TrEMBL record:
Domain of life the protein comes from: Bacteria
Lineage per the UniProt record: Bacteria, Pseudomonadati, Myxococcota, Myxococcia, Myxococcales
Protein name as catalogued: Immunity MXAN-0049 protein domain-containing protein
Domain Immunity MXAN-0049 protein residues, every copy: 65-207
Organism: Myxococcus xanthus (strain DK1622)
Pfam families, per the entry: Imm11
InterPro entries for the chain: Imm11
Length: 215
């Protein structure tokens, strides 16, 4: 202890305050033992290129098999949402249907058979979710963030994050931010539907004014 009081918030998560009713969150899956996809499966385009300006329907195998490479010895099978270090999201069939029931535009589903860490197919109706309509959007002038955790497009420290709806159409309920692979922003509605659905696990960070939390 010895930094005085640095003027910052701990984010807000507030609907009633003044500005916005719909709050924006960074979508993360709170699943560690589920195992992140550490290393890219067969047929996968580069880490950052997964949702970089394009759809993967032409680049990622449709109806193929993919698997978790054992970079890490432990970790279990798949959950509803499967986290990873790349710019792609894996979603279960039931969770897929949730997102579709909200009418989330700019979403594309690439279904494959996913084998977990043990090399067994436990994701038969799972589809990788692509966010389209992405164009360089992240405010980098008002957003206090330190880049390069692994590569240039990996943000480590974030003190402030301003919405990238400046270049991406703000009507999108779910989209992905350009200068970061894992940064997928969702609206309040999106996770609210997941809360009531009773899905495996989610981790939300505030997109608006994201203070000190690590995606």
């Amino acid at each position: 202890m010895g930094s005085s009081h640095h003027h910052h918030h701990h984010s807000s998560g507030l609907v009633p305050r003044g500005s916005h009713m719909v709050k924006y969150f960074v979508f993360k899956v709170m699943a560690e033992e589920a195992g992140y996809i550490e290393k890219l499966p067969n047929g996968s385009p580069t880490d950052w290129k997964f949702h970089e300006g394009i759809s993967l329907a032409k680049d990622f195998p449709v109806g193929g098999e993919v698997s978790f490479s054992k970079n890490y010895p432990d970790n279990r099978n798949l959950y509803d949402f499967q986290p990873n270090i790349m710019s792609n999201l894996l979603v279960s069939g039931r969770a897929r249907k949730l997102i579709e029931s909200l009418g989330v535009t700019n979403a594309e589903w690439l279904p494959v058979a996913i084998k977990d860490h043990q090399g067994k197919v436990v994701g038969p109706d799972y589809a990788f979710l692509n966010l389209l309509g992405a164009e360089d959007a992240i405010d980098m002038e008002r957003s206090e963030y330190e880049m390069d955790s692994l590569e240039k497009d990996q943000i480590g420290n974030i003190d402030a994050l301003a919405l990238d709806t400046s270049a991406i159409r703000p009507d999108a309920k779910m989209f992905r931010c350009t200068k970061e692979r894992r940064l997928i922003l969702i609206r309040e509605d999106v996770h609210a539907a997941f809360e009531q659905a009773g899905l495996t696990g989610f981790k939300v960070y505030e997109a608006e004014g994201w203070d000190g939390l690590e995606l």
